[PDB]
């Protein structure tokens, strides 16, 4: 079921093989093959007990942060975003599954930057008033960081401030801001620096 599905997806996604990588003459698939893999995955999980699909969605994250492969991580994020854009793969479920359990504060700063760029691109995620809840977890990741980390990861880690500023500024057109206040109340009890 889910294990066999993940095995098939890994066998399909992991197309990288250095077979005789010597500088020989052994002779843009990043778009067409991506859509093909997305369609195959959608046709597979469409009839695979979609009620538990959200669980498998979290299982997807199991493969997300597996490889280091920053270009491949960006490609995977882009193709999964496109697959979400096809109406399938509800955005709230996938963002909730990807945000937690793989945060790795400063452990994968590149993966952090790509993940925050992705959630910024998918920050639409239109839903009911139960969306700002995810924001809470975001602040949690900002809480597990003293502001004395490294002079290099400043603008790199600034993606968090960027996405939160975008959320709260477009709240005039994204989501009611008083709910944002009552959500951030979980960080401060009326004044906590």
């Amino acid at each position: 079921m889910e294990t066999q599905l993940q095995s098939i997806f890994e066998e399909v996604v992991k197309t990288e093989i250095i077979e005789e990588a010597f500088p020989g003459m052994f002779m843009e698939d990043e778009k067409t093959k991506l859509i093909s893999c997305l369609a195959a995955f959608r046709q597979f999980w469409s009839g695979l007990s979609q009620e538990s699909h959200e669980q498998c969605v979290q299982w997807i994250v199991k493969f997300i942060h597996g490889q280091h492969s920053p270009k491949r991580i960006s490609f995977l994020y882009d193709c999964l975003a496109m697959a979400v854009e096809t109406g399938l793969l509800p955005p709230r479920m996938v963002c909730e599954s990807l945000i937690n359990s793989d945060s790795l504060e400063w452990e994968r700063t590149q993966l952090w930057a790509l993940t925050f760029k992705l959630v910024r691109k998918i920050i639409g995620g239109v839903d009911y008033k139960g969306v700002r809840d995810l924001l809470k977890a975001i602040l949690e990741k900002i809480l597990t960081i003293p502001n004395t980390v490294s002079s290099a990861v400043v603008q790199q880690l600034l993606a968090a401030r960027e996405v939160i500023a975008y959320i709260l500024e477009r709240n005039a057109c994204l989501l009611p801001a008083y709910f944002a206040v009552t959500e951030i109340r979980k960080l401060y009890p009326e004044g906590k620096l």
Binding site: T15, E16, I17, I18, E28, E30, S69, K71
Partner: peptide, 25 residues
């Protein structure tokens, strides 16, 4: 396009050698 297709086929490329070599080729 060629560089992206090559990098995607590079299993766990490395800091300077692998990336620059693939880019040049």
């Amino acid at each position: 396009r060629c560089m992206t297709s090559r990098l995607l086929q590079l299993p766990d490329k490395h800091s300077v050698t692998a990336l620059l070599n693939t880019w040049a080729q």
